[PDB]
Structures are given as structure tokens and as C-alpha cells.
Amino acid sequence: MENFQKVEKIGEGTYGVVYKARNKLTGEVVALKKIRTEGVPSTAIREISLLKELNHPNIVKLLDVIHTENKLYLVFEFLHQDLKKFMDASALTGIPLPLIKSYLFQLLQGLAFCHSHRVLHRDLKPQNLLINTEGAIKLADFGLARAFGVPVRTYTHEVVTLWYRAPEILLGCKYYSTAVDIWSLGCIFAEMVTRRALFPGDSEIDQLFRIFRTLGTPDEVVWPGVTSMPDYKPSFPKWARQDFSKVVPPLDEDGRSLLSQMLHYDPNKRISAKAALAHPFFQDVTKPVPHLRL
């Protein structure tokens, strides 16, 4: 750490405080993420170490891992804004569709890359999607979930949001897959379009029931095996599925079609990042440069 000058406290991360800092020997401006006691387990150090080679232009670059006095810091490429802040800022007018389309397409490339190596995010959320002045968007904290877990509360006891959590996680599946990230990104896509979170649950049952109210209560017809999952209850209320036309106006037929595929209940049938990239929604994708005030 004495290789760095902290600049400001940036944020409270999932795992610890996040600092903006400058490397005294190289000038680089970085994000430093403290990872909150018998030292760091050796398994977590090896997992993190693999993430140093999982490099992609839509994945926030992991520069280095600093483990001293049994205290752990991750050094990351610094980006100046996140999608949560950008959405809050664009509330009056909404993010223009070409920009939505570009961010979704970039995020899907990020996912297609990571998922080709069977690495998951598992906690995608706007606060994790970071943006630069060149029109890029990038996934932050990719693979930390496998390395450190996803806690119910953060180190500051802030509630970890359930809003982007896939139904198979909520229903207690042990061995969920890359599809969980597709679900999260679908929820984000919808939030970009509508300017409101799709499923803003405030408990696990509220999260599930919000999902069911919009998409229909899942059954063995649309999701084979669902009634056998650990937290499935036969007594769940039975809601009918809503039309996507009601859910995400004014999204066009292509975007509604894609969204529907990203929100399929059955994780086997949910579209892959690779397949999503071929969807007709992206036929006319561009890379607009957003209006950013820093």
C-alpha cells in the first residue's frame, strides 16, 4: 500500500471500501478495493489470480492483487461513472435507444467472453457497470462472487440488492450457471428502457413474487423441474404472465423479443450471451458517445 496515495473514498463496495488512488512509482490512477479473519484463504487467492488473465475490453481490468499483513486489496482499472448514476442523471429524458443498444451489446460481449471460460459474475447490477468517456461500458467485480461469496449485507451492513437476482438462485438451486448473468442483464436492459427497476424486491419472497406477477408463476410447463427446487412452494400464488408490451413500452418488437429470451424461466432455455449477440435487435447497433459530466 505505501506504493499508493489514496485520493478519495469512492464508494462502499460489496467487500470493503473502494478508493481512488495513484501509484507513486508509475503515475497510474487506479481503483483500490479492500476485501474485508485468519488471513485470506488460499482458495480465494488462487481464484483471484485466475481473474488476472480473464481480460476483455468490456471487463474492468484487474491490474494486481496486494496481500500484505494478511489484508487484501485488488487494484483495478479506474472508470469515472457507473450505470446507476448515469440512469439517475438521464431520468428526465431516458437513455436514447442507440446508447441502450450499444451498452447492452458491449455487456453481452463481456459476458460471452467470460462465460466461454465458465466464469460467472453472479451479482450484476447497475453500480457494477462502469462507463467511460469513449462510449464504453464495462463489468466490474467479475468473478469475485466465486472467490469471496455474495453476502446478504455488505461490510457496511448495506443490503445487497436482490433486484437482479435470477429465479433459480431465489428458488435455492445449488449449481446455477452462466444464465444467471443473462437474467440480471435482462433486468438491467428493462430498467434502462423504462427508467424504473423491473423487479425491485425488498425481501427474497417479494423478489420472487414481483417476478411471478410480471412473468407468470412458473410451472412445470414453462420450467420442467421447477416444482422440485428446494424453495419452491406449491402454495405460491398463481399470477398470469403479462405482455412485454405492457412491461417495457416503448421498446420495439426486436428488443421485446430479446428481453423475453433473456428472462426465460428455464436457465437452459434462457438465451446465451453468444446467441444474444446475433439477435436482430443488434443489426443496426452503433457506438454513441454519451454526454458525461465529470
Give the footprint of ligand SZL on this chain (CB under 6 A).
10-11, 18, 31, 60, 76-79, 130, 140
Is 41 annotated as belonging to a binding site? no
- Assess whether 123 carries a catalytic annotation: yes
Residue 99 in grid coordinates = 446508447
Q: For residues 102 and 128, which CB has a smaller minimum distance to ligand SZL in the complex?
A: 128
Shortest gap between Cβ of 43 and ligand SZL (angstroms)?
23
Is 206 annotated as belonging to a binding site? no
Tallying the residues shown for the chain, one arrives at 294
State whether residue 226 is helix, strand or coil.
Answer: helix
> Mutual orientation of helices 97-116 and 179-194 as an angle, nearest 10°?
170
Rg of the chain (C-alpha set): 19
Q: Which of 147, 182, 177, 150 is nearest to 164 (CA)?
A: 182
Q: For residues 73 and 78, which CB has a smaller minimum distance to ligand SZL in the complex?
A: 78
- Residue from 64, 123, 181, 202 carrying the catalytic annotation: 123
Q: Which helix (H) or strand (E) holds 51?
A: helix 42-51
In Å, how far from its chain's centre is CA 251? Answer: 21
Shortest gap between Cβ of 255 and ligand SZL (angstroms)?
28
Shortest gap between Cβ of 228 and ligand SZL (angstroms)?
39
Shortest gap between Cβ of 76 and ligand SZL (angstroms)?
4
Residue 181 in grid coordinates = 448473468
Asked whether the beta carbons of 262 and 183 are under 8 A apart, the reply is: yes
CA distance 197 to 290: 21
Is 77 annotated as belonging to a binding site? yes
Shortest gap between Cβ of 131 and ligand SZL (angstroms)?
10
Is 193 annotated as belonging to a binding site? no
Is 11 annotated as belonging to a binding site? yes
Is 15 annotated as belonging to a binding site? yes
- Give CA separation, 108 vs 46, 153, 156, 179, 182, in Å: 26, 28, 31, 12, 8
Is 18 annotated as belonging to a binding site? yes
Neighbours of 22 (CB within 10 A): 15
In the complex, residue closest to ligand SZL by CB: 31
Q: For residues 13 and 218, which CB has a smaller minimum distance to ligand SZL in the complex?
A: 13
Q: For residues 80 and 213, which CB has a smaller minimum distance to ligand SZL in the complex?
A: 80
CA distance 288 to 100: 9
Q: For residues 131 and 271, which CB has a smaller minimum distance to ligand SZL in the complex?
A: 131
Q: For residues 80 and 241, which CB has a smaller minimum distance to ligand SZL in the complex?
A: 80
Shortest gap between Cβ of 35 and ligand SZL (angstroms)?
12
CA distance 226 to 57: 37
Beta bridge partners of 6: 21
Residue 154 in grid coordinates = 455488505
Binding site for Mg(2+), by residue number, is 128, 141
Please list the active-site residues: 123
Binding site for ATP, by residue number, is 10-18, 33, 77-79, 82, 125-128, 141
